[PDB]
Design a protein around this ligand. Structure first.
Ligand SMILES: *[C@@H]1O[C@H](CO)[C@@H](O[C@@H]2O[C@H](CO)[C@@H](O)[C@H](O)[C@H]2NC(C)=O)[C@H](O)[C@H]1NC(C)=O
Ligand SMILES: *[C@@H]1O[C@H](CO)[C@@H](O[C@@H]2O[C@H](CO)[C@@H](O)[C@H](O)[C@H]2NC(C)=O)[C@H](O)[C@H]1NC(C)=O
Ligand SMILES: *[C@@H]1O[C@H](CO)[C@@H](O[C@@H]2O[C@H](CO)[C@@H](O)[C@H](O)[C@H]2NC(C)=O)[C@H](O)[C@H]1NC(C)=O
Ligand SMILES: *[C@@H]1O[C@H](CO)[C@@H](O)[C@H](O)[C@H]1NC(C)=O
Ligand SMILES: *[C@@H]1O[C@H](CO)[C@@H](O)[C@H](O)[C@H]1NC(C)=O
Ligand SMILES: *[C@@H]1O[C@H](CO)[C@@H](O)[C@H](O)[C@H]1NC(C)=O
Lengths: 367, 81, 367, 81, 367, 81
């Protein structure tokens, strides 16, 4: 059991406190350092598992040794001594630039920093595949690849006497949260007048019991049997956008299509949902164009009316109906038009606040 | 929870669901970056370059060593209270 | 004519449907693969146009062959067999890392992905210039350079028997949309009291008949004879910001200058528009300072009053007047002050919504 | 359409206009990435490394091949209906 | 003294005018070019200080010379003439690709562009350390490193006869603005019901006399004796968020924690501020759990009540009280709940504007 | 100016202050990128590659030279007025 001198330290984030204790639990003991220092001195390979019975294996990597061993030593009696030194000097300056880039002042908090294995690539000689094989990763299936690339390292010791850096890594494994379902949403444009709109919803959302959440797909890979994320991906969704996804069409915002098109059609549940006011739709089975009722905004094409449909020049066979026949636009409460460009947001918010400050003087005088 | 019918009336559909798996880190393994290469088979031909490399490294390594010592010197075993 | 089995496929975006059909139209026939497989086996260059009369030319690229041919083979009887293998192994691991990075799980939808030629650079041996010359691009004028770098590739075949990837590219050419004019906007600061403001408008806008649009300059190059974009650049602009650009000064928002300066002056149509309250303005011709009327916010300097003006220490000769004499601030309706930092936007919107929910209870009680 | 006069009263000017040209893609050309190098002039000196390279490649190539087959197997000539 | 032909030039930003004059003041005279051209022709090193007495030193860099000198020339009588040419050709194409990338059409305004020394790295042979040593930078302390990496270059001459580019750099030095204090803010979550909230404030703010400002930490390094920024970091803060930081808790917005946690505790001024409803808090000195009063939202732990506290499994000794005992939630005016995702912002703003347009018809009819 | 007490009641604390130093650029130094390498010790073995390199460079260098001339030709000494 250890205690932190909080009055002495004065200030620290939870992240710094836990990493600091972790630093104490995982750093090598003072004489394992002297042993490690001596093992490093007597080796000459680019990568080497340093095994001292009793103690755990320590993986040692030397970032320019392959170049020395493969390129400089075989030239030792064919190039001058000056030239050999000039060749290595160029490598050392390029390697120092990477050490500086990763461990220099751009590293804000060395105690709680977690460095991805890929960011260590150059410090480890320009490639990480041999490191991963020595740790047991085969490269034989995509999941092990994703896990191996999710390794993060913490600095546990910096030796200024013998110039080495000890890092501690942990192995990623998959933690399935069975109550969370990730959903990919995809929209088609529809026409109101001469304006072409689409509903603004996120590309990915998550359901979690009562909750609908935002989903950050940045750190995720959509494997065939699950979404694999190397970091937490769930984030709050405002109640209004949740209400939109729960069926309140008036809560969903909409915007005009960029350029001159949307996605005017989509295959979903074996049916074609299509903006047939904006593209040519045609029944292939009968040869007859498919017109969109003008007080409807979309067409839901299934095999009960057209087994094989042509849509913007593409011929698609469809299945039985899984989406009702379109209803009249007047039976749909459309939500507010919006823009997502940040300057448009700021200009419209400034106007709204100004209109609201006017309104702030009028409703006390009459009341 | 999500209402696919009403969303389809305004052109939004779901095109796939999946379970959600997050990576959690466990166990531990020590990795050491050996900054100083073995140059013995180069017979003193890189002595100037190596010494300069070492000097550049010190500027980078000393602040990190100092930052790590600043934390662990405030971490004592429980009975010091 | 081909048909998609939409009931079997179940779900697909328009992008996936069209790319899937394109995959069928452009993929090599089953025995052209056996021919290609045999041509690849017997070649030994880094890049090679594979011509079989009758069939089209296929450009074959081998990502480590120059290294084998230039560096390993000439060393074949001077380095050991182990060393030769170790040298090539390092190249193969570095090349595999790039193949993994580009074609591995981070590639979401291999059917509809379009890979830029520059992203293929490492897969093609670390440089694309020789590929482009074999396809006919000379590098002789900047437009051909931009077009050559706009090439995108689709995957049409992956051979797991002989380990090769067939891609189909298309050639970019310029499509002028004569009704669209791109406009670069540029602002100068003005003073209200001790506050230094500037009007918030986009850096680039587009006019298109009745419409003013946003313009994404990310994918564009501003050549001397036109704006060349490799992608659609036009995007909607909110009606309010359009009204701002149409002359409604009250619709334009404004913000305070960052740091301690704006652009306090600008040369436009041979005149100098200058915030002469914020910098020293001086007529060089007469030697007399140019003061800004205190109920005016800017000074419009032309040769009718000062042929050669000094402005913040820079001496500029100006032409005849193209901008009227400044009007009084009281004759200008200024728009709302705003901030563009996202947290400031969120904090002010939350406040506005809260003020609006209060207002939602008061106007029924009195009415 | 854009009102330069009123914009100039609040410090905004236009400093250049240009026509708008977009790139459209046309025609086609096949490009093949030959992943397996010609090693015959290396006399079996890279046999272990090449075999390992091939094994690493399979993990990457098979899912793509499978994804492409999943689409084209649903694309039949018109008369199959 | 020089004058700009503003009527001839027609249009220019202040940035282009000042850089254009700077171009005249700093470009080499016409015959220094002929001298420089002759000095460049007769040299053969990768980097070389060209000293002609009278004139200033000019640092000349040749981006492929180390490769020619170290790799090609020593092979001159062991490899064929064709092979030597093929080896250099690969380097030249890779070097041309970098010249094209930096100086080609993606460089919008060559007159006023400022190119960072790190962006020039490849043009200078792949590393900048030797350039910096020739200019006097030792690499001996972190501040000189930061300053050396803040060097920016302007193009002053492009020679199409002999193919060289002259750049002018300036040396960065530190300008302390003693009236500006940078503050790092850090929050802990608190519970309202089953909802876990935290206050939304920026990570860094600046105080400047009367003003609280936003602070962009992008270009800054937090050295132990000051914040070193290579660019202006100060930017305006909206009055409402300033009021929040001045003590108006109702002006501060709040949002729900992402994932399933916040920072549930923090060490500050030798005390522990902790959400003890969300984590186990325990007095180590007495062995007794520390419960959070249910009408309080946080616990402020100091040595007057618990000298050594355990918090989420971590044991921390604390100092004397520097934060008052928690007050009842009912004595705290909480501000508005918000979301920071941009689509949530847009959807809620669209709704607010729609609600405001309704309200715009009702308050004239009753009044 | 910042009210730490009221902020602490809603979980916000300051965990560090510092003075603010900005970099200002001064003096000057000329740097020249020599694009054409010295190839004399290669005895005409790279003549084709060098000539092609030079041709590729011209496409890039000429527009910049032209842009610089377009500005400085409008910068005259004061007495031209
Ligand atoms: C599906 O959408 C419609 C609106 O498009 C919802 O119907 C509205 O409901 C509100 C309040 O519930 C009523 O005041 C409106 O009069 C209805 N409008 C129309 C046009 O019918 C319907 O409730 C939605 N279904 C769900 C589950 O949300
Ligand atoms: C140019 O700007 C001025 C405002 O700065 C516009 O004048 C205002 O117009 C509104 C409605 O059109 C009137 O109610 C105001 O009384 C006017 N304000 C002032 C100060 O005159 C003018 O219309 C604008 N011109 C254009 C084309 O928009
Ligand atoms: C500290 O915070 C409290 C609110 O949490 C402030 O007290 C409020 O002040 C407003 C206007 O000043 C009063 O109308 C409210 O009735 C007060 N609310 C409560 C719950 O007391 C207090 O003024 C703040 N201190 C500072 C310096 O801003
Ligand atoms: C370097 O390598 C040699 C050979 O591997 C080894 O025996 C020695 O211990 C190391 N030498 C030094 C000086 O560190
Ligand atoms: C490799 O190269 C040789 C020489 O170019 C060529 O003739 C042969 O067909 C290729 N060899 C193999 C084994 O693929
Ligand atoms: C190139 O190098 C040689 C030797 O350094 C030098 O003397 C000569 O002036 C340069 N030669 C040419 C042709 O530029």
């Amino acid at each position: 059991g250890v205690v932190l001198a909080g009055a002495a330290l004065g200030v620290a984030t939870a992240a710094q406190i836990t990493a600091g204790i972790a630093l104490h639990q995982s750093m090598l003991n003072s004489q394992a350092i002297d042993n490690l220092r001596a093992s490093l001195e007597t080796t000459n390979q680019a990568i080497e598992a340093i095994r001292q019975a009793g103690q755990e294996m320590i993986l040692a990597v030397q970032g320019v040794q392959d170049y020395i061993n493969n390129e400089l030593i075989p030239s030792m009696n064919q190039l001058s001594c000056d030239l050999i030194g000039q060749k290595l000097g160029l490598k050392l300056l390029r390697y120092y630039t990477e050490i500086l880039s990763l461990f220099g002042p751009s590293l804000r908090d060395p105690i709680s920093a977690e460095i991805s294995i890929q960011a260590l690539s150059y410090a480890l000689g320009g490639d990480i595949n041999k490191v991963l094989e020595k740790l047991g990763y085969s490269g034989g299936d995509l999941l092990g690849i994703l896990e191996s690339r999710g390794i993060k390292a913490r600095i546990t010791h910096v030796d200024t006497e013998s110039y080495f850096i000890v890092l501690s890594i942990a192995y990623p494994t998959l933690s399935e949260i069975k109550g969370v379902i990730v959903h990919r949403l995809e929209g088609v444009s529809y026409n109101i007048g001469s304006q072409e709109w689409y509903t603004t919803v996120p590309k990915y959302v998550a359901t979690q019991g009562y909750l609908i959440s935002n989903f950050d797909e940045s750190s995720c890979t959509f494997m065939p049997e699950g979404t694999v994320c190397s970091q937490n991906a769930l984030y709050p969704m405002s109640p209004l956008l949740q209400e939109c996804l729960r069926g309140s069409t008036k809560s969903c915002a909409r915007t005009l299509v960029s350029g001159s098109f949307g996605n005017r059609f989509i295959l979903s549940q074996g049916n074609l949902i299509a903006n047939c006011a904006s593209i040519l739709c045609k029944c292939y089975t009968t040869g007859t164009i498919i017109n969109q009722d003008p007080d409807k905004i979309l067409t839901y094409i299934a095999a009960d009316h057209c087994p094989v449909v042509e849509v913007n020049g593409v011929t698609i066979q469809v299945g039985s109906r899984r989406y009702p026949d379109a209803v009249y636009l007047h039976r749909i409460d459309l939500g507010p038009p919006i823009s997502l460009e940040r300057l448009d947001v700021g200009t419209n918010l400034g106007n709204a606040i100004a209109k609201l400050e006017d309104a702030k003087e009028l409703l006390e005088s009459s009341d | 929870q999500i209402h696919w019918g009403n969303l389809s009336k305004i052109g939004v559909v779901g095109i796939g669901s999946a379970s959600y798996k997050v990576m959690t880190r466990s166990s531990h393994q020590s990795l050491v970056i050996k900054l100083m290469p073995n140059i013995t088979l180069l017979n003193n031909c890189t002595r100037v370059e190596i010494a300069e490399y070492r000097r550049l490294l010190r500027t980078v390594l000393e602040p990190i060593r100092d930052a790590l010592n600043a934390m662990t010197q405030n971490i004592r075993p429980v009975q010091s209270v």
